[PDB]
Structure formats: structure tokens, C-alpha cells
Amino acid sequence: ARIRHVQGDITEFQGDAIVNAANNYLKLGAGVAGAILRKGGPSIQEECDRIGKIRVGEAAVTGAGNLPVRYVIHAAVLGDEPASLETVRKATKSALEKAVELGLKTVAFTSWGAWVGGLPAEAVHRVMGEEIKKAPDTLEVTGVHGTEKSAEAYRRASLEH
Numbered sequence: 001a002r003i004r005h006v007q008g009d010i011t012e013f014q015g016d017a018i019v020n021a022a023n024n025y026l027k028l029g030a031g032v033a034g035a036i037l038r039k040g041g042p043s044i045q046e047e048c049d050r051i052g053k054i055r056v057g058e059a060a061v062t063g064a065g066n067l068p069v070r071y072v073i074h075a076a077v078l079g080d081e082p083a084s085l086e087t088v089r090k091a092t093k094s095a096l097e098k099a100v101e102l103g104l105k106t107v108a109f110t111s112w113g114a115w116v117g118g119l120p121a122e123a124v125h126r127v128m129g130e131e132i133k134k135a136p137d138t139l140e141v142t143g144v145h146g147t148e149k150s151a152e153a154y155r156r157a158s159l160e161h
């Protein structure tokens with residue numbers, strides 16, 4: 001699937017779904033997840049509680065409450081196991097699989113930087129990029145970045161080559 005890189009707040013993404021990097025317990029905290037709790041509202045954690053624990057590397061879908069998307073796809077990158085390039089690969093693939101199963105088109109990711117600080121950044125980018133590339137072209141992916149400088153850096157890299 002194609003990806004477009006933009007600056008923004010993923011909780012303002014208007015489209016079919018946002019991907020939420022998660023622990024496998026599916027319990028939300030601060031950061032992007034905190035914005036989801038607040039802006040999405042109580043139904044998101046309530047539905048996560050109804051799903052219960054999943055395995056690291058899997059994904060699970062909830063509604064999105066008052067967010068401007070239909071679904072939140074929670075992608076379990078760590079929790080009862082530490083993050084690894086393998087868990088990143090599996091969680092990205094699993095999140096995309098859920099989007100395909102739901103018949104979605106537009107899906108947003110963050111860089112997952114705040115979940116992968118112990119892993120080589122270039123490798124994380126490669127593995128996520130590879131899984132997104134392999135996903136069907138029925139999906140259109142948006143990468144949402146905190147700063148314009150960084151969003152543009154991702155765009156420039158997408159040219160070369």
C-alpha cells in the first residue's frame with residue numbers, strides 16, 4: 001500500500017481508522033493513547049477491557065468513540081514481552097490485516113517512536129515500511145508526524161529511492 005507522510009495529530013485524522021501502538025494487555029496510558037482516551041472517550045478502554053489480553057504481535061479492533069474515524073486498531077508491540085524488530089513487524093502486519101478484514105481504505109499510523117526506543121530507528125522504519133508496502137492497494141496509509149521538519153524528511157526519503 002501507498003503511504004503519505006504528514007505533520008499532525010493522529011487523533012484528528014479523518015478517515016476509516018487509526019492504528020494505536022499498544023501493550024498486549026490493551027491498557028491505555030499517556031502519549032497518543034492518552035489523547036485517544038480523552039478525545040475518544042470512555043468507550044475505547046471499555047471495549048479494550050471486553051477484548052482482554054492479546055498476544056504481543058497481534059492486533060485488536062475497537063470503536064473510536066468521539067474520534068473522527070470509525071475504528072481504532074490497537075497493535076500490540078510490547079507488554080509481557082519487550083519490543084523487538086519481530087514484534088514491530090508482526091504488530092504492523094496484524095494491524096493492516098485487521099484493516100483489510102474490515103474493508104477499510106484510509107488508515108493512519110504514528111512512527112511508534114515512543115514504543116521502540118531500544119531498537120535501531122532505521123531498522124524499525126524499514127520493517128514497518130516493508131509491511132505497509134506489502135499490504136493491498138485497497139489501503140491508503142497516512143504516516144502522521146509531530147513536526148513538519150520530520151514529516152518532510154520522511155517524504156524526501158521516499159524519493160531516494
Ligand SMILES: *[P@@](=O)(CCCCCCCCCCOC(=O)NCCCCCC#C)OCC
Pocket residue numbers: 003109110111112124125126128129130132142143144145149150151153154157
Ligand atoms: P524527524 O524527527 C526523523 C526523520 C526520519 C527520516 C526517515 C527516513 C527513512 C524512512 C524509511 C521509511 O519509513 C517508514 O516506512 N516508517 C514506517 C511507516 C510510517 C510510520 C507512520 C509515521 C508517522 O526529522 C528530523 C530531521
Ligand SMILES: [Cl-]
Pocket residue numbers: 021031032110111112113114115
Ligand atoms: Cl505512538
